[PDB]
């Protein structure tokens, strides 16, 4: 199976992970928030939590969200790429 090594930024912390390169983002986001939170908790950092209603997304440096329905590969996210896990509140 193909994999991508990505850097995830969450709460000013970088976390390296190995992710399936072919799955849609949609099926990785909630799973990734849980691994993230495990790492933050070991660092005694407050886990990431849903301010009200809204959507967790993986974002480029400029705020651009990945498409939920496409893979990392299809979106040109490769080894060493960095993504920000961000919550968008619905207001």
Numbering used by the authors: 17 to 107
What are the paper's exact sentences on this?
The ubiquitin-like (Ubl) domains of EccD5 dimerize and interact with the cytoplasmic domain of EccE5 at the periphery of the ESX-5 complex. On the cytosolic side of the central pore, the EccD5 Ubl domain formed interactions with the EccC5 domain of unknown function (DUF), which follows the EccC5 stalk domain.
